[PDB]
Design a protein around this ligand. Structure first.
Ligand code: MOK
Length: 167
């Protein structure tokens, strides 16, 4: 049994809710929250900007030190950093950004990072301002992630379309 409430069960291991990921993290304090990161860990907008704002920019400060030491992530890659006030840990995962012309086949590699964690609170990777089709992102998630994933989806309209169209 875990602390996640109000989720619709899609599969053995994937659950979904219409919820603002920031508010959900603040309430649950999960072991792992996933960030929709870019390779530079520049948390300007989208999920990343919202998570970082909720940490009062401490996520960005920590991320700048990580990049100064290690250099950029790979598209499809990840790193584990602090979860600050939102979670124990933040798994920063880089899905391909379609609006930058990145290979959508890298979305599966991105989701494979989730398998290193038993339970996660996450957004749909490569969706929103990353330009991918969120329906596709949910399909790759279900077909790739084997650990227990709680997907929070901000937009009620998109949430309803993801549930209604789920095979
Ligand atoms: C899809 C999608 O596109 N934009 C967002 C989003 C969610 C929270 C904060 C900012 C953007 C989002 C999501 O993960 O539900």
């Amino acid at each position: 049994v875990n602390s996640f409430s109000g989720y619709l069960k899609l599969t053995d291991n994937v659950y979904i809710k219409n919820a603002d990921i920031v508010e959900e993290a603040k309430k649950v304090k999960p072991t792992v929250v996933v960030n929709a990161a870019n390779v530079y860990l520049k948390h300007g907008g989208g999920v990343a900007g919202a998570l970082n704002k909720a940490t009062n920019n401490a996520m960005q400060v920590e991320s700048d030190d990580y990049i100064a030491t290690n250099g950029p992530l790979k598209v499809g890659g990840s790193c584990v950093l602090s979860g600050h006030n939102l979670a124990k840990h933040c798994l920063h995962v880089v899905g391909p950004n379609v609006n930058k012309g990145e290979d959508i086949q890298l979305l599966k590699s991105a989701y494979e990072n989730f398998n290193q964690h038993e339970v996660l609170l996450a957004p749909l990777l490569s969706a929103g301002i990353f330009g991918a089709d969120p329906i596709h992102s949910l399909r790759v998630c279900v077909d790739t992630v084997r650990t227990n994933v709680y997907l929070a989806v901000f937009d009620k309209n998109l949430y309803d379309k993801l549930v209604s169209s789920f095979l």
